[PDB]
Structures are given as structure tokens and as C-alpha cells.
Design a protein around this ligand. Sequence first.
Ligand SMILES: Nc1nc2c(ncn2[C@@H]2O[C@H](COP(=O)(O)OP(=O)(O)OP(=O)(O)O)[C@@H](O)[C@H]2O)c(=O)[nH]1
Ligand SMILES: Nc1nc2c(ncn2[C@@H]2O[C@H](COP(=O)(O)OP(=O)(O)O)[C@@H](O)[C@H]2O)c(=O)[nH]1
Ligand SMILES: [Mg+2]
Lengths: 430, 426
Amino acid sequence: MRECISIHVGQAGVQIGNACWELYCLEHGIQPDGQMPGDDSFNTFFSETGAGKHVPRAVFVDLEPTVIDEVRTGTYRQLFHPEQLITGKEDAANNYARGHYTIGKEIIDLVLDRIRKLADQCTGLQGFLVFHSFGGGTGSGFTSLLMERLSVDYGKKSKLEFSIYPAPQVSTAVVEPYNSILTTHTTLEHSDCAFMVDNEAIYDICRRNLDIERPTYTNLNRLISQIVSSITASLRFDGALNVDLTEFQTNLVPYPRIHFPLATYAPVISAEKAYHEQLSVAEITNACFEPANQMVKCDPRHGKYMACCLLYRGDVVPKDVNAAIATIKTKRSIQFVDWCPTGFKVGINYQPPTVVPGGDLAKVQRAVCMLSNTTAIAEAWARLDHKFDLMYAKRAFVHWYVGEGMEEGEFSEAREDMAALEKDYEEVGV
Amino acid sequence: MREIVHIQAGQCGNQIGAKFWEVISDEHGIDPSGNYVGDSDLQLERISVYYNEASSHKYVPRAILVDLEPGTMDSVRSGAFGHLFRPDNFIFGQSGAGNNWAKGHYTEGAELVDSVLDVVRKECENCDCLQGFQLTHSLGGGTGSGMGTLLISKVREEYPDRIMNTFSVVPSPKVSDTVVEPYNATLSIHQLVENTDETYCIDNEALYDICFRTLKLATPTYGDLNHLVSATMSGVTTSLRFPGQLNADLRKLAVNMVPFPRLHFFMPGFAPLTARGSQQYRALTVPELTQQMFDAKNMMAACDPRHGRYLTVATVFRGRMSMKEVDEQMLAIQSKNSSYFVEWIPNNVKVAVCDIPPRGLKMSSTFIGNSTAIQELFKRISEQFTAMFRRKAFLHWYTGEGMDEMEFTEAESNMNDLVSEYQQYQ
Ligand SMILES: Nc1nc2c(ncn2[C@@H]2O[C@H](COP(=O)(O)OP(=O)(O)OP(=O)(O)O)[C@@H](O)[C@H]2O)c(=O)[nH]1
Ligand SMILES: Nc1nc2c(ncn2[C@@H]2O[C@H](COP(=O)(O)OP(=O)(O)O)[C@@H](O)[C@H]2O)c(=O)[nH]1
Ligand SMILES: [Mg+2]
């Protein structure tokens, strides 16, 4: 019936996808072999064969075999259908050109047919989920192209994506601005909604709050996986208030050109503090609206709140929820745009936030997933635009892109679009 | 899958290549007999990159040995690892170039490079997906420079889009193992300035200083320097041969590290470097490695990076590490070292992490910088070349080989353009 297709592009998307599907398997009590030794909202995310073997609905795409081979040799190799795993003979080399244009074009058709058949298996298909890194060549280019194609093909079907946002200070590559800018250009022109995540902010969050050792991508991906799973859990179980993705599209997007919800998750605490900590809805929301608990390095106090969605899990009573929201509204440190009477959309689900075995996050009977739009993200876009402006001003690395079939006017147009975005945020910010 | 062809120029190319394939044999657990004794799947997983599967299930390293003086290759064959290579991989002439670039290149390399090119085509046909070629050679040597130059030119001619990188021994500033070196280095660099994607500069003097100082040595020989350099050469390729986070392909690294077509020159570095018995007082952490790597003393190229600015920096890590540590260290280092980096290139650092450490150590790292200290190197070489060229010393040999003066002139002009271009960005 109601179903969704989860696309994973690039190492980030693949790994996050692995952790994600693992968490799903945990939540649905499904084993790596597809066996499960009320929940049909799992059939929402899964199919079934003659032996009662449950398979996930997803397509993994990496232009280089790499992590997908690591997955083929991984635990869940028995879970995923071998056809869903698609690998090329070489990477995009952090070059938007290749992935968006030169390489992926000889691949993506297979992926489209794959997704098409997966969509043929569907009945009530609501939309898609695209996991990729923002600024990474493969993810950027291939997801841009794929999002264009899917946008054309499926039309009104909900298109959601989780993009790993380049950090202001730390960077894994020098060419990230180019890819990111081209990405947001071609992606903005298509994608319905995009969730931004800054690894630096995750480091800050875990390190300062979760009080763990200096981490690796594992627990970060687990956290993001918890967030995503929380959303899908809003969709995957019967609560007091159930929320379709279309409702997120409806409520969180005031304007077609502006969608960049910032994710923040609570409670985030050590297993030890959980005993000294008393979690109340009001307290969790108070924690949710703190700037330090944001999954992005963007400071909310430099802008105003347009739309805010709060998803509740486990044991929650809407009475103290609306009470808490009022208590939050009373706070003038948190300010909302003048033309918005209310920016709050609430939902609640009886299913609690189960914890991953061997996980570092404390077990709680309730949790809150927050999605929010602000112009401080436009400030972030500004700094990124500045980096790109300099790097492009000196024409660094451009010869690769050009030689691989890009153009100067392309970068120019992307820049223009970014300027337009900035001014859109500015005007809406008024 | 992704595969690399390792071409070994005569002399140090072959020697370094020998030690290099020894290191690789240790990496994948390949016995010198050709049999695989390794205990891990990761070893055999992507092994096809540097190796081929024989019908006898002996792993043939993929390489082509080229020298004009068979004695070296004979010494290679007499070696324990000479059995790994098939006898077809050995291609040589019976007359050495005698440190004459023009002679080898125009005369004695052509026949041999034709044969070698045939063998290259064979090895290329054996590839499912060819990533590129790697050349171990020396600047200033006749065979290496001349034959390497010609061969690389033809290799690009045949394979324009493939990755072309070379590990080249640069002339030592305060010492020389031969005369006429500026000419050969100049010509070689010229053709290598136009014909390759990237190159690595390593000086034996700096290696002597580094090893003697840090490792507290007494009587080190070329084998040890080759061991270190080979450790680096194997170090940069780990992300391709093993799983990890932010796996960096060679061309991706080339893309990240090269801001402009003509400046690809890199100065490698390696950590940890510590003497035996002093290791007990050392704690292995990302800060330690990063501090060792960004230290001017540990630069294997001969120069001082303190004079210049970094256009691009790539740091590849080995073993189990924390991303947080790396990020924090890169930010902190980049923060305190500000003004040593280009202002119009935000985030000069390129990070990659392989989960598999080098054998014998819990963790390690390799540093690849790009800086105008190499412009200083080129200033030195240009000066020496000018001094030698003014009085027409040794020119009669090259003119004897039919080498025209205008070639030297043009080469010098190109060097001037190179150092100029280095001065242009700063
Ligand atoms: N949060 C998180 N981000 C990741 C992870 N892996 C990669 N990334 C992001 O990805 C960026 C690096 O580029 P990749 O996405 O890995 O690019 P790729 O998947 O290798 O594809 P190519 O660009 O073609 O090489 C980094 O800046 C990270 O922000 C991960 O496991 N977790
Ligand atoms: N690192 C290293 N360098 C070497 C080795 N052997 C020779 N060289 C360098 O190669 C140069 C000699 O050039 P050579 O190859 O003999 O010239 P050719 O015989 O005419 O090609 C010297 O300047 C040395 O610095 C070695 O084993 N290791
Ligand atoms: Mg990749």
C-alpha cells in the first residue's frame, strides 16, 4: 500500500543507508537473512517473497565498487537483492562534471529501470528518500541527474533527500564548493525538500552532550539514522497523530523555492546522565530549541523561524505538548516571522525510540525530532558562496571541469541562482 | 577492476622498484615464490590492481623493467623477488646511455621503448579497467630521464586520459653524484612538465639528514632510503587496495592536489619517524603524526617550506583513527600556521583514512604538499644549468647525438615559465 523507495548514492549515502536499514531491521525485528523470528507499515518499506523472506526497497549506487563491495561482503548481503546493488568501474573523483554528466550517464539508466521496477512493485507509492553527501562528486552529480530524471518521471511523488552539509571550518576536500553549488543549483530546481546536516555540529553535539570519545562516522550515521527512523516511525506506526510526507511538504514549505529544514534531535545524553536526567516533554522541547543541539553549525538566533515541525515518539501526552509549545512561544529569544501566525505542526507516535545494540545513546521512553527553516542557513549559504566566489575568482581547478565538459557560464549561472536564493531568503526574512 | 601499471626505469628505478614490490609483497602477504600465504581476504580482494592471476595461481606483479645496462636487472633477477616477475618483464639493451639524455632518448630508447610499448599494450589488454601508469625513475640519469621521458610521452600519446604519475629523484643541492645533471634534469622536467599529470620530488640528501637525525642511524645505504620512499609509495595507494573512510582514488587525489595544469609538483612526507628505543617515549596519536608531517625537517624534498605558501595539502592516514581528531588537528594546524597557506584557497587540506595500518605499526600517515619551495629548487637547477650552459660544457656529446641547442634554450625558457608561474601564484 503506502510505500517509499530509499536511494543511496556515494559512500556517505551507502554507509548511512547501511546504518539506516540496520536500524529499520532492529525496529521491525527483522534479521539480516530477511526472516522475522501489526507492523505491516514495515511492508511499507519492505517486500516479501514465497518463503516469507523480507527484502528492503532501495537502490545503492556507487560509481566505484568500494563500500558497496564492502556491503556485498557485509552482514546484510543476505538482506539486499543483488540487483539493487549497482557498481561502476571508477569514481567521479570529486568532480561534478563526471558524475552529473560524463560517467553517471552510462550508469543511471540501469538505476532508473531498477527504480522503475521497484516502483512497479509498489501500489500506493508516496515518494522517495535520497541519501548523499553534499559536495561529494558522485553523490552531488549523480543525485542531481537522478533527481532531475525522477522528477520528470514520477511527477507529484514526494522527493526527499538528506544532504551532508559542508562544514564552515573542517573540510574533506578543496573542491567541495564547486560541487555543492552546482548541486544546489540543479537540485534546488527539482527536489521538494532537502535536510541539511553538518558533521562538525554532530561532533560538537556528541562530544559536548553525549560525552563520548572522539568519534568516527559510525555513531554519527547512527544518530542521523535515528532521526530518519523517527520520521519514518511517525509514518510507520499508529499514533494519536499520524503524519504523511506530503504533510511535511505542505507544512514545512512556505514557498516552492525555499526548502531547507534543519534537523535537531533530543534527548541526546550519556547512558550515565539518563539516571540523573528526568525527561519531560517541556524539557525535551527546551533542549530541542537550544542552538547547541542543532545538527548543523548554523546559529538560529541570526534569523527567524518560518516553519517548525515537532515529531514525538513513545510516551507523550499532547496536553503538556501544547502547553510546552505555548511556554516556548512565550520565549522571545526564539522569534518567528511576522506574517506567520503559527509555525508549529505537531505529531505523536506511541512507538518509542528503540536503541541500537552496542549503541552509545541512552535508552529513553520518549524522544523528539525537530525540523525547522531559518535564514541563518542563508548566512551559511553566503559563506559557502563566498568560498566558491574566491575559488572561482582565481579559476582554481576549473580546467578539470571544463576539460570534462563543463562551462564557465554554468558556474556563473549557478552563482546567479545562489544570489537569487540569498535574496529570496532576505526578502522572506523581512 | 581498477588496475595500475608500474614501469621501472633503469638503475634506481629498478632498485627502488624491487624494494617497492617487496613492500607490496609484504602488504598483500605474497610469498617471493609467487604463492599467496596471506591470512586476510582484503589482501586478495582488490589484489588484481598490482597483480595478475597465473594458471598456477602464482601472483605476477604487474610491472615492466627497463634498463640499458643489464647488470642491474641481473642483480634484480638474482634477488629473491626477481622470481615474481615473468622473464618477459625484463627488457634491456646492451649499451648504457652513459648519463647522456639525448643518446638514450633519441637513439637507444626508441627500439627498447617500442618493445616495452608492446609489452605495455599486453599488460593494458590484461586490464579490466586501467586507472593509469606509475614510473619510478631519476632526474639526471641518462636511461631514466631519456627513456622515461620518451616512454611517458608515448604512453600519454596512447593513453591520454589515464593517470600519469612518477616518483622522481631530484638533484641534491649541496652534493652531486654526477655532472651534466642540470641539462638532463632540465630536459626531463620539460617533457615531464608537459606530458604528465603529476610527479613526486625526493632528494637523497634530505633523506640522509632525515633518517640520520630521526632514526639515529650510522651506516645507512640506498636500500633504506628506497625502503622509506617505497613505504610512502605504498602508503599513498592504500585507499585503493583497502576499505576505509574517504577512500581517495589517485586521479581524485590528482584533481584535489592540482589547482592548475602546469603545477603538479609535490613534496612527500611520512610519519611516524622514530628511532628504536625512543619509540617507548612516543605515544601514537593523530596530533603526533600531524605534527611530524607538518614539520619542515621531515620534508623529503630538499628545501624549506617555511618560504612559500601551500596551494594544496593532502594527508592520508592508515590504521584505526578518529575523524574528530584528524579534523581538529587539521583545523588547529591550519589555524596556527595561517599565512603559510593560500588565502584564495579556503580549506587547503585533503583528508583520507584507511583502516589498515602499515605492518609493524598501530597507525601511520603520509603527507603530500604543494609549495613554491619547489620554485626555489627550480631556481637552483636553473642557475646551475645556466652556469654550465654558458660555457658549453659537455655539450659536444649531446650535439654528437644530434641534440640541437634550441632544445636546451626552449627547455630553459619553459623552466623560466614554470618558476614564473610559481611566482605568479603566491
Ligand atoms: N556524516 C557522514 N558524512 C560522510 C560520511 N562519509 C562521507 N561523508 C561526507 O562525504 C564527503 C566526502 O565525499 P564522499 O561523499 O565520500 O564522495 P564519494 O562517496 O567517495 O564519491 P566521489 O566524490 O565520486 O569520490 C565528506 O565531506 C563527508 O562530509 C559518513 O559516513 N557520515
Ligand atoms: N634513492 C635512490 N637514488 C639512487 C639510487 N641509485 C642511484 N640513485 C640516483 O641516481 C643518480 C644516478 O643516475 P643513473 O641512474 O646512474 O644515470 P644513468 O645510468 O645514465 O641512467 C644519482 O644521482 C643517485 O642519486 C638508489 O638506489 N636510490
Ligand atoms: Mg565514492
